[PDB]
């Protein structure tokens, strides 16, 4: 007998549940609806649904009122929209967390075994007719094909939004403090416990590792001078595991906190900037609190970075990304009067979604040079050879690549994408469309409607047979981008919730923590309130190059 | 130079902070006050402080309106008070959690290293003049003395509130799923991760252990028939660590989930009742969901116990305890419109406070027998010899002992108390009075005022020299109880916050979880909504003896 939850009867986030041998029941509790499948809008839902516009529309306003916005941006009308923007968006990611690769139902296990990445939607039943549940071919498109066919870059399509590589890496660096999959435990698990902005990619992700990394004096971080400039310490003092290639594990082999941060000048770069910052922070605090120990100086400085980070990510990273005229702003106080749960848990869907590999270029321009992957990948002197100043200047100037539209992933890394489509499958993520509904959108009615064009479209129908079958990852990257955008609609709609739920879900964002004493001194609190990319750099360098999340001119 | 935070200048929960070499600064943020030491009541605080009565008074109302209460108890006026009672009380325990034995300041470490028990107040600076900070003798009363002198029972003073041993144990059993100190890591740490009502004293506190305990079929729990009655399985099938004495580790050596639950028929007893329940639950669910696996049946059943437990503890355990005419009630919906954080973290102060060892009797009456400790402690057949029915009946009939007033701890166990006073000291808990303020009360002005009498009082002044020096644990147990009460004031005032913060902070209590699908079926949800002690027993026994948290007649 077909497991009825294979059709996904329940609507509006209603829990599907097997009853007896062949039946089921939807648990529409607090969904806003009622009925066998939750499709009978309570009086208010109906109102809200009849008065609420298309998110397609909002994106319009948010990206047009050249004037209306400068005025809104100059008055409280700002915080208002901010508070709004937040609440709504965030009210989507269930919290406490719901399911995981091992449980398509609430469990005390799912709740506490921090190991399991968490999911928004259950998985597609292991006994469902089709792979995605009901529609499609008994076999999903050969991922390797599906990749080169639609995701493989042909001509480098740069991001119309002006994004730059200086941003490209940061993303990567940053995003790697919570997305750490366990090869050992396999897909669906994560090393990076802590789920979120804890910088456990600077201070490592385990107590030992941190200590092997801590200079246990003045609360600073170990390090080494080369050319007179500060840089992360090598394993020969920082006895900690890494991933540098079998060559010169001694000198030039730097320890950071994030195992794989040596494999690319970019990650190591940032890894430097931060460390060089932390220590910098310490220098500041110690002045204010001589009677202070080491542990303190350290922890307090840590937070100040969790702060600065969460600010910069929002008021600059997410900004540039969004394309809004509305001036995003970080201020935990805006949720102080809401019903918010200060606690995040990384979702596998979030992970899949973040794979913005197409961001990467063709080559890596630097002044007159133009390092090819081979010269870049695993290179191990580029960083010290050129210097942060210069290197940053060299990224903030090279455009990144459109993350959507399709066909924009380089060939060298094209393999990742294939694995994501392969991994997605191990995980059993429901169809793109099922993941549009869950995130407040309408299911596409056809590949034509999906993609802006018709060429790819037709081919994809030929492959998936039915639009509903379409997968998660592919959907996102193949979706028609917004006009002059970096990526389509579904990306933002699905991303932000996860995104902001995690930026503001950080304990430091809670009333409890968000005090000036938590960052000891008013000096700490101001560093967090006034952080900037331009400052994260130039305050920790000899000279101030050009730094921004977008290209100049 | 004296570390100024040794005086505890900051008031109303204001953070004391060293600035420069010899100064300090109070961070009065959101405390309701302003000023160097936070003692300048903002306009509203002032109002609230000028209109709010003594908690001494409230306890009066809550324990007198014989009629007013039956009427309040019969109308919504009930839920109202309940919602009130909760919110207030709970709004005290900082959450996210603040400090731990290792940090007298917010830290990412303190936040995530679930190992550390957490504290409400910082510790008493390791460089303060006196042991408690400012006042007292450079040496605290020899704990061993202080114990036998004031806490050692002389004549058995039973609980005037009618409490019974059937309650006595439950307390112990129950309280042991979150209070598990690591001999290895030492005081200030805890094995029982999960902090709270997770029954990790049934299903053990680690994944392996659970599996060694799980019968992996129909989601039930391993077990064995003796006399035809169900009982926990012995290690010879349940290959899991225990603490039974070097004698017959084979038969009669039962595995439960809570290592030390063999050392007393009471704990093992309950341990049985629960298991016999869980399995019972399973039998029920499986009927409703044949298409169900094992893991599910298990997890779902687990929650139903976390439910039942949280209900019974409140609507019966806390009830009997309180002495209120108001009819306490468990209903997570009552906080759905509040700003509550579904997340607890056991506090060391909470632990200290819960040491209600004086609950224990002199001997252990059973029908005509009267087992002395020696015959009780570690006994290992009593349980199977007599039978749950009979045994329960035998506890629900023997009175417990006044937990306060002083001098009511038995000699056999009197050692625990001494260690608590010794442990408290390792921990460096601030003075009782400092812990009265923090919990919304006035500091006692004299030992006379503290104790209802004057004998003990005088002696204690002679020892501590100054009332303020008085310790935490001793304070509580030496405090004058309320009239016809089980224990003084400070106990409830300090206990409930921790207490209810933990009962309702359980994820199942969140909107997210609190659905009928979380307990799959409406049948599950009703088991939780209608749990009872009388039912926990009699539904899992041959016959229904006498069961209640108090003595009959
Ligand atoms: C988060 O969640 C993951 C699980 O998804 C946790 O990691 C997994 O943990 C389990 C348990 O440690 C581990 O188990 C695997 O299963 C093998 C099967 O075991 C056998 O089958 C049953 C199970 O009890 C027994 O009847 C068998 O008999 C044994 O009985 C004796 C008892 O003393 C044994 O000593 C004797 O050897 C005998 O075989 C037997 O146990 C197990 O054998 C094998 O070791 C294997 O590891 C998973 O493999 C773990 N790995 C993962 C990622 O799945 C993770 O720990 C959780 N996180 C936290 C902190 O809770
Ligand atoms: C929660 O919090 C507790 C801590 O309160 C965690 O448990 C403790 O964890 C620490 C770290 O594992 C452990 O450390 C102890 O300290 C000893 C001192 O170590 C030496 O001093 C410094 C420290 O790095 C080094 O310069 C020394 O040199 C070493 O360098 C080499 C590097 O490869 C070493 O291999 C070489 O041996 C050399 O000595 C040296 O490390 C440490 O040596 C000793 O092992 C000791 O364990 C605490 O003892 C732990 N125990 C407790 C309860 O305090 C707990 O893990 C946290 N929970 C979680 C999950 O995070
Ligand atoms: C938007 C962030 C981002 C960027 C810019 C990026 C840029 C690059 C890059 C360009 C220099 C190269 C050569 C790689 C190479 C890899 N990446 Co990424 N990756 C990124 C996010 C990820 C994520 C997320 C994963 C999956 C595992 C994890 O870390 O959680 C990943 C995994 C991988 C893997 C392992 C196999 C797999 O899971 O498919 C390789 C190899 N990569 N990556
Ligand atoms: C109100 C609950 C309660 C009860 C009724 C109770 C009843 C009894 C009892 C009666 C039959 C005996 C013989 C003991 C014996 C002991 N108890 Co308790 N204990 C209780 C709560 C605790 C707590 C709490 C601890 C501290 C450690 C922990 O488990 O977290 C404890 C610790 C102990 C210790 C270890 C040394 C120490 O920490 O002082 C012994 C021995 N005991 N206990
Ligand atoms: C790693 O990067 C260094 C530069 O930091 C590479 O050396 C440069 O190579 C180009 C041509 O390959 C020369 O024109 C530059 O002058 C070199 N820079 C200097 C001064 O050394 C090096 O070849 C790279 N290694 C790898 C992996 O290819
Ligand atoms: C453990 O408990 C058993 C009872 O379950 C004890 O045996 C009883 O002992 C009393 C006197 O000591 C007899 O009058 C009862 O008739 C006995 N019960 C039966 C039928 O065995 C036993 O002595 C206890 N063991 C210890 C540790 O003393
Ligand atoms: C609720 O969802 C189910 C599942 O899709 C709907 O479909 C069932 O009933 C339909 C109408 O009678 C039939 O067309 C289908 O054969 C049947 N499918 C299954 C698998 O049950 C059902 O109609 C929905 N009910 C409502 C009120 O929309
Ligand atoms: C704030 O708290 C301090 C600490 O107790 C108070 O005490 C200081 O100032 C008093 C009045 O001038 C003196 O009597 C004390 O010597 C001094 N003590 C210390 C250690 O600083 C201070 O008065 C308080 N201020 C207010 C406004 O109440
Ligand atoms: C925990 C941090 C996680 C993510 C933070 C960084 C980037 C977010 C990733 C995806 C976000 C999706 C779209 C982003 C662009 C605009 C949305 C943000 C503003 C909004 O719409 O509420
Ligand atoms: C996580 C569970 C922790 C504790 C639960 C069980 C017992 C509580 C322990 C101490 C509570 C202190 C006083 C109890 C008596 C009355 C208070 C409860 C009602 C109230 O005043 O809000
Ligand atoms: C619900 C009340 C407002 C009407 C909703 C209209 C939704 C129109 O939708 C949006 O309109 C924009 C221009 O208006 C277009 O640029 C967008 O592409 C389109 O999606
Ligand atoms: C080259 C830069 C100068 C541009 C001047 C014209 C700016 C018009 O700007 C926009 O025009 C819209 C009309 O479609 C109005 O609805 C908007 O409110 C206004 O911001
Ligand atoms: C603040 C507005 C109400 C007045 C507060 C009076 C506080 C009196 O206090 C309480 O009064 C009870 C009887 O009234 C006594 O039984 C209690 O022991 C006593 O503490
Ligand atoms: C032996 C049981 C019968 C008792 C009958 C008298 C009950 C009185 O009861 C109480 O009396 C108070 C007067 O002090 C009133 O203020 C209270 O409202 C009332 O509940
Ligand atoms: O994208 C426009 C809007 O779409 C809605 O569905 C979200 O809930 C809003 O928070 C968002 O601002
Ligand atoms: O004990 C009476 C009252 O005392 C107050 O301090 C608490 O905040 C209340 O929740 C409690 O009901």
- Cα torsion B216, B220, B223, B225 to 10°: value is -130
- The Cα B466–Cα B429 span in angstroms is 17
Residue B174 and residue B171: Cα distance in Å, rounded?
5
Contact A83, A335 (CB under 8 A): yes
Complete DSSP assignment for B409-461: B-TTTHHHHHHHHHHHHHHTBPPTTHHHHTTT-PPPS-HHHHSSSSHHHHHHH
> Cβ of B290 and A21 within 8 Å?
yes
Written as six digits, the tokens of B512 are: 């997210």
Q: Helix (H) and strand (E) counts for chain A? A: 23, 8
Mutate to test the pocket of ligand 3, among A191, A416, A423, A477 (most ligand atoms within 8 A of CB): A416
**Long-range contact set of residues B108-112: C-beta below 8 Å, sequence gap at least 24:** B108/A198, B108/A299, B108/A302, B108/A303, B108/A306, B109/A299, B111/A507, B112/A193, B112/A194, B112/A198
C-alpha distance from A194 to closest chain B C-alpha (Å): 7
Q: Are B516 and A292 an interchain contact pair (Cβ–Cβ within 8 Å)?
A: no
Surface-to-core class of residue B171, CB atoms within 10 Å of its CB (0-12 exposed, 13-18 middle, 19+ buried): buried
A354 labelled catalytic: yes
Q: Give the residue carrying structure tokens 């928004």.
A: A120
Q: Tell me if B2-42 shares its fold with B43-552.
A: no
Ligand 15 midpoint to CA A439 (Å): 10
Residues 28-47 of A with CB under 8 A from B: 29-30
Please report the atom of ligand 14 found closest to the CA of residue B65: 20
Q: Which of residues 330-389 of B touch A (CB under 8 A)?
A: 337-343
Among chain B residues, CA nearest to A197: B108
* Angle made by CA atoms B29, B33, B35, in degrees to the nearest 5: 85
Tell me, yes or no, if B523 comes closer than 8 A to chain A by beta carbon. no
Pocket residues: Cβ below 6 A from ligand 7: A 4, 7, 9, 36-37, 39
* Ligand 7 atom showing the smallest separation from residue A35 Cα: 27
User: From residue B351, how far is each of B118, B119, B150, B159 by CA, in Å?
Assistant: 10, 10, 21, 21
CATH number assigned to the domain with residue range A43-552, chosen from the 4 options 1.10.10.10, 1.10.640.10, 1.10.3720.10, 3.40.109.10? 1.10.640.10
Which experimental approach was used here? X-ray
Q: How far apart (Å, rounded) are the C-alpha atoms in residues B18 and B109? A: 21
Closest residue, chain A, to B336 (C-alpha): A339
Judge if the beta carbon of residue B9 lies within 6 A of ligand 16.
no
Q: What angle do CA B449, B450, B451 make, to 5 degrees?
A: 100
B419 lines ligand 4 (CB under 6 A): yes
What is the DSSP secondary structure assignment for residue A347, as one 8-state letter?
A: B
Q: Strand pairing partners for A224?
A: A231
Q: Give the closest residue (by CA) to ligand 9 atom 10.
A: A495
> Hey, is the C-beta of A511 within 8 angstroms of any chain B C-beta?
yes
A5-34 b/e (C-beta count within 10 Å ≥ 16 → b) = bbbbbbbbbbbbbbeeeeebbbbbbebbbb
Tokens representing A391? 């290197």
Question: Which of A29, A340, A515 lies closest to B27 in CB terms?
Answer: A515
β-pair partners for B130: B133
Q: In this complex, do B96 and A512 lie within 8 Å of one another by their Cβ atoms? A: yes
The SS3 call for residue B231 is: strand
Cβ–Cβ contact A264 with B under 8 A: no
Query: Positive or negative, the Cα torsion across B403, B408, B412, B413?
Result: positive
Contact between B536 and B308 (Cβ < 8 Å): yes
CA distance B306 to A148: 51
Is the CB of A484 inside 8 Å of chain B's CB atoms? no
> Which residue matches tokens 């200030």?
B188
CB-count exposure of residue A95 (10 Å: 0-12, 13-18, 19+): buried
**Tokens, residue B535:** 């039912």
Atom 1 (ligand 11): residue with closest C-alpha? A53
B16 cis-preceded (ω within 30 degrees of 0): no
Tell me the C-alpha distance between B63 and A281, whole Å.
Answer: 56
For A208, other C-beta atoms within 10 Å of its C-beta total: 10
Q: Distance between CA atoms of B308 and A291, rounded to whole angstroms?
A: 51
Per-residue 3-state assignment (H helix, E strand, C coil) for A229-275: EEECCECCCCCCCCCCCCCCCCCCCECCCCCCCCCCHHHHHHHHHHH
Angle between helices A77-90 and A489-503 in degrees, nearest 10:
100
Enter the tokens of residue B305. 């116990």
Q: At what angle do helices B77-90 and B66-73 cross, to 10 degrees?
A: 100
* Burial of A168 from C-beta contacts in 10 A (0-12 / 13-18 / 19+): buried
Catalytic residue flag (residue A176):
yes
Residue B376 CA to residue B374 CA, distance in Å, equals: 5
Q: Which amino acids bring their CB within 6 angstroms of ligand 3? A: A 168, 171-172, 175-176, 179-181, 264, 351, 354-357, 359-360, 413, 416, 419
Q: Which residue, chain included where needed, has tokens 């999340």?
A: A549
Q: How far is the CA of B433 from the centre of ligand 14 (A)?
A: 36
- What per-residue string of b and e applies to B6-33 under the rule 16 or more CB within 10 Å gives b? bbbbbbbbbbbbbeeeeebbbbbbebbb
Asked if residue A234 lies in contact with residue A251, where contact means CB atoms within 8 angstroms, the answer is yes
Contacts of B300 in chain A (CB under 8 A): 105, 107
Contact status, residue A250 vs residue A191, Cβ threshold 8 Å: no
The values of phi and psi at residue A372, to 5°, are -85, 165
What are the residue boundaries of the structural domains of chain B, listed by start? 2-42, 43-552
On whether any CB of chain A is under 8 Å from the CB of B517, the answer is yes
Give, as one character, the DSSP assignment of residue A102: T
B residues 79..98 contacting A (CB < 8 A): 94-96, 98
The active-site residue, picked from B7, B12, B354, B371, is B354
Cβ contact B27–A512 (<8 Å): no
User: Omega of the bond prior to B58 within 30 degrees of 0, cis?
Assistant: no
The catalytically annotated residue of A203, A270, A289, A354 is A354
> Is the C-alpha dihedral spanning A302, A303, A306, A311 positive or negative?
negative
- Quote the Cα angle for A348-A483-A468, to 5°: 45
CATH class of the structural domain B2-42: mainly beta
Which tokens hold the place of A397? 């100037």
Phi, psi of B230 (to 5 degrees): -75, 140
A144-155: burial string, b at 16+ Cβ within 10 Å, e else: eebbebbbbbee
Residue B293 dihedral angles phi and psi, to the nearest 5°: -75, -155
Cβ of B521 less than 6 Å from ligand 14 = no
In angstroms, rounded to a whole number, what is the distance separating the alpha carbons of residues A149 and B99? 55
Residue of chain A whose alpha carbon sits nearest to that of B338: A339
Beta carbons of B109 and A15 less than 8 Å apart: no
Among B117, B172, B328, B499, say which to mutate for ligand 10: greatest number of ligand atoms within 8 Å of CB.
Answer: B499
Which ligand is nearest to the Cα of residue B498, counting in written order?
10
B126 has a chain A CB within 8 A of its CB: no
């Amino acid at each position: 007998p077909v497991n009825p939850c294979c059709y996904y009867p329940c609507q509006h986030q209603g829990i599907c549940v097997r009853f007896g041998l062949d039946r089921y029941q939807c648990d529409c509790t607090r969904t806003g609806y009622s009925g066998p499948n939750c499709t009978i809008p309570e009086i208010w839902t109906w109102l809200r649904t009849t008065l609420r516009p298309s998110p397609s529309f909002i994106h319009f306003l948010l990206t047009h009122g050249r004037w209306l916005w400068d005025f809104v941006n100059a008055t409280f009308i700002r915080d208002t929209l901010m508070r709004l923007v937040l609440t709504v968006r965030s009210n989507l990611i269930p919290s406490p967390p719901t399911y995981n690769i091992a449980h398509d139902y609430i469990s005390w296990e799912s709740f506490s075994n921090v190991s399991y990445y968490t999911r928004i939607l259950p998985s597609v039943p292991r006994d469902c007719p089709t792979p995605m549940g009901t529609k499609g071919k008994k076999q999903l498109p050969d991922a390797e094909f599906l990749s080169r066919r639609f995701l493989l870059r042909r001509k480098f399509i740069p991001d119309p939004q002006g994004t730059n590589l200086m941003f490209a890496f940061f993303a990567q660096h940053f995003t790697h403090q919570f997305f750490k999959t366990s090869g050992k435990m396999g897909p669906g698990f994560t090393k990076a416990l802590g789920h979120g902005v804890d910088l456990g990619h600077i201070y490592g992700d385990n107590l030992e590792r941190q200590y092997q990394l801590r200079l246990f004096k003045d609360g600073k971080l170990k390090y080494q001078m080369l050319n007179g400039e500060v840089y992360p310490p090598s394993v020969e003092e920082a006895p900690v595991l890494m991933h540098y290639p079998r060559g010169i594990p001694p000198q030039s082999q730097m320890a950071v906190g994030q195992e794989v941060f040596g494999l690319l000048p970019g990650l190591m770069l940032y890894a430097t900037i931060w460390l060089r910052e932390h220590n910098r922070v310490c220098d500041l605090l110690k002045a204010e609190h001589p009677t202070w120990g080491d542990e303190q100086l350290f922890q307090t400085a840590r937070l100040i970075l969790i702060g600065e980070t969460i600010k910069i990510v929002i008021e600059e990273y997410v900004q540039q990304l969004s394309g809004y005229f509305l001036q995003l702003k970080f201020d935990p106080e805006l949720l102080f009067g809401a019903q918010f749960q200060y606690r995040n848990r990384i979702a596998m869907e979030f992970n899949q979604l973040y794979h913005w590999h197409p961001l990467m270029p063709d080559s890596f321009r630097v002044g007159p040079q133009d390092y090819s992957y081979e010269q870049f990948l695993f290179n191990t002197s580029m960083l010290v050879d050129y210097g942060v100043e210069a290197l940053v200047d060299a990224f903030s100037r090279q455009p990144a690549g459109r993350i959507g539209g399709g066909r924009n992933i380089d060939h060298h890394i094209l393999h990742v994408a294939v694995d994501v489509i392969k991994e997605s499958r191990v995980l059993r993520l429901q169809p793109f469309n099922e993941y549009r509904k869950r995130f407040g959108m309408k299911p596409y009615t056809s590949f034509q409607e999906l993609t802006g064009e018709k060429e790819m479209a037709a081919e994809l129908e030929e492959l998936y047979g039915d639009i509903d079958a379409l997968e998660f990852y592919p959907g996102l990257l193949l979706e028609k981008c917004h006009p002059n955008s970096i990526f389509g609609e579904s990306m933002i709609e699905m991303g932000a919730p996860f995104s902001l739920k995690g930026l503001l879900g950080n304990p430091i964002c809670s009333p409890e923590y968000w005090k000036a004493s938590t960052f000891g001194g008013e000096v700490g609190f101001n560093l967090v309130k006034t952080a900037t990319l331009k400052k994260l750099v130039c305050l920790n360098t000899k000279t101030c190059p050009y730094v921004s999340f977008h290209v100049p001119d």
